[model samples]
Target: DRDYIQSIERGFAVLLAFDAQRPNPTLAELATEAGLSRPAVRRILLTLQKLGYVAGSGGRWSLTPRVLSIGQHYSESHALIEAAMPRLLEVAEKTQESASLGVLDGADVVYAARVPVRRIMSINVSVGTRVPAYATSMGRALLAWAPADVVERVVAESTFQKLGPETIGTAAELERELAKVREQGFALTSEELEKGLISLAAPVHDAGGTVVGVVACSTSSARNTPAQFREQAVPCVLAAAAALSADMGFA
Candidate 1:
């Protein structure tokens, strides 16, 4: 069976182009970004518009709220987010920190859910935010669960761009960190994704005991230390992951 690989690729490319920074684009801009011709981009946009995935006005095309339905469908179909929501909120309430659920997307981690703390300096991270998997505790937890070959390929392909002073920018260091996370069943990183941010995460597994995703808690340096994170937050996140996994039919 032959796949319409180009069409499929372009369709997803259009979807990926809609992110936090670039939420809308002209047809020419989409074409340049997607590496497709203007006509091809127009056709794809038209198809998406007709399908209610996108809308256009005043020469700019943007994804519609219907696009969220796609993500919502996945979340509703997956047991992880629904089962983990209560536990996630519990952890947030206990620690007064932001707790999140994430899934690995290539070398990135996409937030599935987030509970933000109410504070003067609380970072307002939202669901659907994408962060480098190599630099985030949640990402490391998921990466630790990935197959060896996939992990290697991710390291090779990762740009490892430095986002913060503590960001891990080397594949060897990331690999070692992931190994430690695997052994410990959780990961912690301080000031890796952003300054003053500390995060702890644990992986969730499926029925076959394969790592599927991650749940995490993040707080500011003013709120928690690396030691406090290990002693206090890690257990909550681990329990949340386990609860979610059990709901997913993992024993």
Candidate 2:
């Protein structure tokens, strides 16, 4: 006797159709991308707009900050967030930079938790932010522990745009980087995700020893040299990762 609310599904479909690839889309484009009819997509967009989750201008629709509440709610209720926040804060405190936790999603790594001290890059990274796995330290750290097929799939699906001077541009380079990450149990990048930004990331494992998340910290080159940043942040990140893994019930 449970009747599903089909409109909710359609609304979510319309919402999901907006991503990094399609940050702003017109009505017809949303309809085609969401696999829904124009009229249905229009109604869904209107509802989302009314609910303050989306906005429209010049016949194009885009998500607003209100849409982030959905992601915020997920983090609020997840156990991983509970375990990660303290560690992230610790890393941020020790390095005097921003710390975050990320989880792999296809070709992207989505931020699940964060403790920000200052903005180290031009782009704003919040709990819901998604970055390409091939070019980010958190992404490479997560990919290092993922299955080979998953790594292959993510590599194949990635667009591989060079956002920074050190960004990985080829599959072979990405493979080499991931191999190094696996061997070292952490990933470090200098101006790879963004120019003037350096990041360090280590994996968090669960009870089954599966890599569930990545703990990362980012700093600007102006604050410290790479050697200094590593000297101060590496041990802290590794300690945070160990604490997070223990919290996740990993032995």
Candidate 3:
């Protein structure tokens, strides 16, 4: 703790404060949201703006696409994403649905690889997209393999809002759902993150046989029912995950 750089932490905190909820925040807003002094946030914003990572006018600040490289670096340098990309593409082609690779990051699942066949969600998804871990097939697929303590901490910390009528509404309910996902070896989330979306996912293992990520496929409910997804897409997602795991040197 003593060895950590407080400036670096504060700088990141300032950067992380920008999102859909407050996409273009002023210096004063960022100072309050990031829990940093106005002077500290101003310094951080000035530095970021000079570096071309933050750009705006009229006292507002927004991140530029260059910030994407931060997440891109992780995807490009990770052996798992490299090995899993082709499999997800093949899954997309075979299923005519979106296929993705995701890993648990705190209480979120960060998409590392994606192959889209069509637009299915209100928000566009690509590499670096983050979705709530509690309501996503890929999230649960990854979370089911996460340490029990990690799962408990995330569940306890979550807001547990009912994103959809069928969304898990409480931490206790999510725990029960995770238990089922663990025993079933796959996750199928329907209308949990948003209405009209159905997704199926399975865990990917590294060479060491530890669950490292998840591979998932999704379709709009208008196009396919949950039962239809189970019958047609689950096997494909599971196969793609297995293929990626094999490429990662897993048996």
TM-score of 1: 0.67
Give the winner by TM-score: 1 or 3: 1
Q: How many backbone clashes does candidate 1 have?
A: 0
Please provide, for model 2 over 74-162, each residue's C-alpha lDDT reduced to its tens digit, 9 standing for 90 to 100.
44228888889999999988877778999888899999888988553433677889989999889899999788999999988998998
Q: Which stretches of candidate 3 lie over 4 Å from their true place?
A: 1-77, 119-123
RMSD of each: 14.7, 14.1, 15.0
CA lDDT of each candidate? 0.82, 0.88, 0.84
What TM-score, over all chains together, does every model reach?
0.67, 0.67, 0.67
Candidate 1: C-alpha lDDT: 0.82
Candidate 3 RMSD to the real structure: 15.0
Clashing pairs for model 1 are none
Tens-place lDDT per residue, model 3, 210-237, is 8888888888887889998789877878
Cα RMSD for candidate 1? 14.7
lDDT per residue, candidate 1, 27-87, as tens digits? 8777888888888888998999999999998879898888666655554325676776887
Models ranked on lDDT: 2, 3, 1
